């Protein structure tokens, strides 16, 4: 339902993201990947946390 997300996000009008703390105890976080390159470093989607 890509169109629905596109629609509701556009209708809202902001990308305002407030970073919120979680527990994530027991899993390795961050989880970079080769495809996503930021500052010539392996990385990932900014708003998503890979759990390994």
């Amino acid at each position: 339902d890509y169109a629905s997300l596109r629609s509701l996000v556009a209708s809202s009008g902001t990308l305002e993201f407030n970073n919120e703390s979680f527990n994530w105890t027991g899993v390795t976080q961050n989880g970079t990947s080769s495809a996503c390159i930021r500052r010539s470093k392996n990385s990932f989607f900014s708003r998503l946390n890979w759990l390994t």
């Binding site: 169109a3 629609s7 509701l8």
Partner: protein, 52 residues
């Protein structure tokens, strides 16, 4: 000096007005089951179409 009124012309014009009024006020449009225009949440696609 005296004053009197022509009845025939008055009633002819009034009859025209009456026919016009009859063609507007009398009609009734019957409609039972329809879409909903009040939406509690944000549903994306389907909401945009029916609101439009």
């Amino acid at each position: 000096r005296g004053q009197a009124a022509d009845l025939k012309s008055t009633q002819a014009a009034i009859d025209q007005i009456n026919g016009k009024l009859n063609r507007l006020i009398g009609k009734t449009n019957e409609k039972f089951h329809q879409i909903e225009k009040e939406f509690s949440e944000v549903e994306g696609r389907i909401q945009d179409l029916e609101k439009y």
